[PDB]
Design an enzyme around this catalytic site. Structure first.
Site, mmCIF file in Angstrom:
data_model
loop_
_atom_site.group_PDB
_atom_site.id
_atom_site.type_symbol
_atom_site.label_atom_id
_atom_site.label_comp_id
_atom_site.label_asym_id
_atom_site.label_seq_id
_atom_site.Cartn_x
_atom_site.Cartn_y
_atom_site.Cartn_z
ATOM 1 N N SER A 47 0.798 -1.229 0.000
ATOM 2 C CA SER A 47 0.000 0.000 0.000
ATOM 3 C C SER A 47 0.837 1.290 0.000
ATOM 4 C CB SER A 47 -0.971 -0.022 1.188
ATOM 5 O OG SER A 47 -1.883 -1.137 1.114
ATOM 6 N N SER A 95 -6.248 2.774 3.753
ATOM 7 C CA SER A 95 -5.575 1.914 2.777
ATOM 8 C C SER A 95 -6.573 1.005 2.049
ATOM 9 C CB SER A 95 -4.484 1.097 3.461
ATOM 10 O OG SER A 95 -3.502 0.709 2.535
HETATM 11 C C1 L5D Z 1 -5.069 -7.773 9.120
HETATM 12 C C2 L5D Z 1 -5.063 -6.957 7.850
HETATM 13 C C3 L5D Z 1 -5.094 -7.576 6.612
HETATM 14 C C4 L5D Z 1 -5.082 -6.832 5.446
HETATM 15 C C5 L5D Z 1 -5.052 -5.452 5.505
HETATM 16 C C6 L5D Z 1 -5.036 -4.795 6.732
HETATM 17 C C7 L5D Z 1 -5.114 -3.313 6.809
HETATM 18 C C8 L5D Z 1 -6.193 -2.621 6.253
HETATM 19 C C9 L5D Z 1 -6.285 -1.244 6.360
HETATM 20 C C10 L5D Z 1 -5.293 -0.529 7.001
HETATM 21 C C11 L5D Z 1 -4.200 -1.187 7.546
HETATM 22 C C12 L5D Z 1 -3.086 -0.401 8.191
HETATM 23 O O1 L5D Z 1 -2.155 -1.050 8.710
HETATM 24 O O2 L5D Z 1 -3.150 0.857 8.144
HETATM 25 C C13 L5D Z 1 -4.121 -2.576 7.453
HETATM 26 C C14 L5D Z 1 -5.026 -5.567 7.897
#
Ligand code: L5D
Length: 242
Positions: A47, A95
């Site tokens: 991301s 994200s």
């Molecule tokens: C457990 C998991 C799996 C896939 C994506 C994320 C996620 C989704 C949105 C923001 C974030 C973050 O860190 O900022 C992390 C979490």
């Protein structure tokens, strides 16, 4: 120009982890890292790719401005904050992969490839699926390469309009107080080994800017908060923030 301080490894090992922090002092044009080798190893951007992807989508008119609403497609996903409407600001903040997957489809392969080459972005390789190559395709970037790309963005020197760069820097806003401003983007790469977390961006002070790029091993999602926590601990150790 580059100094290696292996004592910073303690910030990672104390959490039973391994990683790299890269700092760049813009006024002095000097870089600092705990691991020169890992600072130049290339990982999936995941991301953190939302920075170049936003720039390209804005500059081509795929995204009109930071207020345009991207409607939820009604498919329930496992991240609750994704099951809602977003604009560019909230899509960056949470994200929101599926909004950026649709951006990439509208950009298309040819324009995406051309723009990443114009940006000198990582290995500039979009092999894979156009809507997921930054998650499981061939594109790779190092922490030092993240710094190089971010410095161009800060100085409005990328080959897109000044407006597009100002809008993306607005969307990167993460923290601000009377002492500093952080503009940055997190990343979390799980589809290709080794699984890692990223945090890349910069700290604005009254009279200097410090760019940073970190990645760390991330065997489970339980450690994601360490991406920012460790980075801020390095910044505090180095007297960049209080
Ligand atoms: C457990 C998991 C799996 C896939 C994506 C994320 C996620 C989704 C949105 C923001 C974030 C973050 O860190 O900022 C992390 C979490």
């Amino acid at each position: 120009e580059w100094q290696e301080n292996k004592s910073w490894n303690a910030h990672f090992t104390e959490h039973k982890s391994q990683g790299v922090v890269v700092l760049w002092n813009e006024n002095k044009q000097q870089g600092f890292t705990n691991n020169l080798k890992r600072a130049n190893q290339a990982f999936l951007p995941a991301s953190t790719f939302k920075i170049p992807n936003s720039l390209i989508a804005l500059d081509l008119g795929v995204v009109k401005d930071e207020h345009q609403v991207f409607k939820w497609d009604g498919q329930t996903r496992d991240i609750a904050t994704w099951n809602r409407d977003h604009n560019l600001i909230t899509a960056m903040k949470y994200s929101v992969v599926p909004v950026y997957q649709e951006f990439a489809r509208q950009i298309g392969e040819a324009r995406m490839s051309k723009m990443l080459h114009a940006f000198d972005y990582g290995n500039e390789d979009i092999s894979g699926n156009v809507d997921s190559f930054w998650l499981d395709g061939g594109i790779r970037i190092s922490a030092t390469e993240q710094i190089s790309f971010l410095r161009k963005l800060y100085h409005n020197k990328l080959h897109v309009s000044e407006r597009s760069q100002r809008i993306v820097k607005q969307a990167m806003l993460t923290e601000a107080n009377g002492d500093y401003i952080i503009r940055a983007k997190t990343g979390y790469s799980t589809r290709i080994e080794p699984k890692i977390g990223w945090w890349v961006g910069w700290v604005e002070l009254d009279d200097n800017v410090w760019f940073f790029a970190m990645n760390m091993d991330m065997p489970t999602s339980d450690g994601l908060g360490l991406r920012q926590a460790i980075t801020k601990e390095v910044l505090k150790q180095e007297k960049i923030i209080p």
